[PDB]
Design an enzyme around this catalytic site. Structure first.
Site: not given
Length: 256
Positions: A10, A79-80, A206, A234-235
């Protein structure tokens, strides 16, 4: 079956986020490439040299161009990273067996490239101690950011170990969402990006890509397959590394 996974970090991160998952996938017999994108990880460029998400995606596009005819890879973006997947899929969809989104943005083809990012900023408006700056590149004012250490601790690495959070404080760099550039970018196409198999992996635990945002994305652009990992943060490639390798083994066995 064995596959060649290309792991895509990300913004503000680098290949290093995948240091637990890459040995695990290799121990299952897979080939793994973990790239540093432009001005990321130990890539020599600084973010002020980068004018768009497409330029930021150059290491991934260069990697895919270097694949010999007939070699397909499974892209895995966290993520992104889903935006780098969409950019790559519009240039090299024949080289992509499938794309796996890992607590990731899921761009579509019906709305502009910034659509899910605009929605993320509505659902998660307070980035706590994250700092911002601007620079000019190719006539455009780009907003850069450096992820705040409390935001890293509480929202991105919530349940990660202190030694994993330490790597994030040591290695995260200035980056950009290039949000205003994505808003004026040509839409992702139905024939490129729209054609690849898309597997959406997420956890409802998350703390930054909240359930409202991720369930909103699944409804907005229906994935071919959805895997929900219980617990973690999230990770998930750090808190649920084993579960992510199991899911990726299944994808390797399903899409080629």
């Amino acid at each position: 079956a064995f596959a060649h996974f290309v792991l895509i970090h990300t913004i503000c991160h680098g290949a290093w986020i995948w240091h637990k998952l890459k040995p695990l996938l290799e121990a299952l017999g897979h080939k793994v490439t973990a790239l540093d994108l432009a001005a990321s990880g130990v890539d020599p460029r600084q973010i002020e040299e980068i004018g768009s998400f497409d330029e930021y995606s150059e290491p991934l596009l260069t990697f895919l161009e270097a694949l010999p005819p007939g070699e397909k890879v499974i892209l895995v973006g966290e993520s992104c990273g889903g935006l780098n997947i969409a950019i790559a899929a519009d240039k090299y969809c024949e080289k992509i067996a499938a794309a796996v989104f890992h607590n990731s943005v899921l761009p579509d083809t019906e709305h502009c490239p910034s659509y899910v990012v605009d929605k993320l900023m509505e659902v998660f408006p307070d980035w706590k101690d994250t700092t911002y700056f601007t620079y000019t590149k190719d006539g455009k004012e780009i907003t850069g950011l450096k992820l705040g250490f409390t935001l890293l601790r509480e929202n991105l690495y919530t349940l990660c170990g202190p030694e994993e959070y330490e790597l994030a404080k040591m290695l995260t760099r200035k980056g950009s969402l290039f949000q205003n550039i994505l808003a004026k970018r040509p839409f992702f196409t139905k024939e490129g990006y729209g054609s690849i198999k898309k597997i959406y992996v997420w956890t409802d635990q998350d703390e930054i890509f909240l359930p409202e945002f991720q369930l909103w994305q699944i409804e907005n652009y229906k994935p071919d397959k959805v895997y929900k990992v219980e617990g973690g943060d999230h990770k998930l490639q750090l808190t649920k590394t084993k579960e992510i390798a199991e899911i990726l083994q299944e994808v390797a066995d399903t899409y080629n």
